[PDB]
Design a protein around this ligand. Structure first.
Ligand code: CUH
Ligand code: CUH
Ligand code: CA
Lengths: 241, 241
């Protein structure tokens, strides 16, 4: 029953992870937007000393979000939050019960975090070459069950971990968002439409189809607009190699 | 009844993380060293096609390590492995039971993976400036309970995640091992001996005192020797500004 507050921002795929898990848990919770990149509020370091989004407070007295309680637990780091939601809500089966299937879920999150997320970040925010990101996405795709399903078979927090970023990639490419070259945008677009990535396309579609996504997504159009506010997304700038 | 094989390498802190958890778990297991950085066996991509240490097999018929079975579960990524071992040995209490303390464990691992490991890498492999690593260590020291204890109070896999790296840092610094200058090496040794870092020195002592560390650590001088065999550590080489 203890309260849950998630501090969030529409553009943020990390915050999006946790909204999805909270929907899949059926949790009662409060979200509060934080302009973390343009105008961080002065109280925000009390909920997260690291000054990143998402931030979560857990239990303590019901306060307004801009009036955080010292008595609430402050949880940082979106993957830690997903595991926490799974622990709080075992009835929701947000992880398998079998230890091998659970390791499948954990390995998928690790593969994404360690080899994929850094490429999305560099390609989009630094304009680094696209080929290593497509390699890493082919690798991640190879970890999926071949005949359909989610990362560990049944949906789990592994899929909440990963869909926010894969679901952003297609519309951002179509909107031309990112500091990569024209040449790599075409390459990525043709690639993500090619037979080689059909499996990851089916996985995006399957995850997007769940209420947890539809209820945490502003719409492709609106998410593009939100991304367009990110300072690092310096419009009119591209890098070439 | 299910067999565990860990493919290992003495120099590897990621392999070392999983050895420590297995010792804490009371597990029955086999380790098999792989010269991954210099002469990888060709069967190796059969247990981990990412070609990385550690690798793990679980179950299947008991075969010699160098003849893996296509029937064993192949588990990759050391943090996935730590969670797997905690799932396999719940009577060993490798994580807390309380959800908030579990979240402490998960957050500390994410902080190290997300903000510290990349800095060690930068400083030791590219000899970049030492100061952002010291800040990130102070951040991580800040997450520990100030008056004593491990990351989550009781010992947990979060400690297995982190001590392989911290425990290596001190002897490598004594050895000049790494691409950083003498000057940054001095600054780092002085810093890690100053009162600023008393708490993280305590944590390393407390982790190193447990048998799980003793039984998985070849000795300070031996671990240094193994580290010299790592090409990217480029022994006798140093960068200056
Ligand atoms: O928004 C994105 C993003 C998401 C999908 C594709 C490209 C970029 C993003 C990706 C990594 C990050 O580390 C990060 O902070 C970010 O905002
Ligand atoms: O071995 C080390 C290392 C250990 C202690 C201090 C400095 C570096 C290490 C650190 C990051 C890595 O990504 C990695 O592969 C590594 O081997
Ligand atoms: Ca496969």
């Amino acid at each position: 029953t203890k309260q849950i507050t998630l501090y969030t921002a529409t553009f943020s795929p990390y915050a999006h992870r946790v909204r999805i898990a909270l929907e899949e848990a059926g949790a009662e919770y409060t979200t509060y937007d934080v302009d973390i990149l343009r105008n961080m509020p002065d109280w925000f370091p009390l909920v997260n000393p690291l000054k990143k989004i998402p931030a979560m407070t857990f239990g303590g007295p019901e306060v307004p979000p801009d009036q955080p309680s010292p008595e609430s637990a402050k949880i940082a780091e979106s993957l830690a939050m997903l595991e926490f939601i799974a622990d709080l809500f075992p009835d929701a089966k947000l992880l398998p019960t079998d230890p091998v299937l659970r390791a499948r879920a954990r390995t998928f999150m690790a593969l994404y975090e360690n080899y994929v997320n850094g490429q999305f970040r560099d390609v989009w925010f630094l304009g680094t070459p696209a080929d290593p990101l497509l390699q890493a996405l082919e690798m991640l795709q190879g970890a999926l069950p071949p005949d359909g399903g989610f990362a560990a078979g049944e949906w789990s927090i592994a899929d909440a971990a990963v869909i926010p970023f894969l679901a952003r990639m297609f519309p951002y490419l179509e909107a031309g968002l990112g500091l990569y070259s024209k040449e790599d945008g075409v390459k990525m677009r043709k690639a993500m439409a090619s037979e080689r990535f059909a499996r990851i396309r089916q996985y995006v579609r399957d995850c997007r189809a769940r209420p947890s996504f539809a209820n945490t997504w502003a719409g492709d159009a609106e998410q593009v607009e939100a991304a367009k506010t990110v300072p690092m997304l310096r419009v009119g700038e591209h890098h070439h190699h």
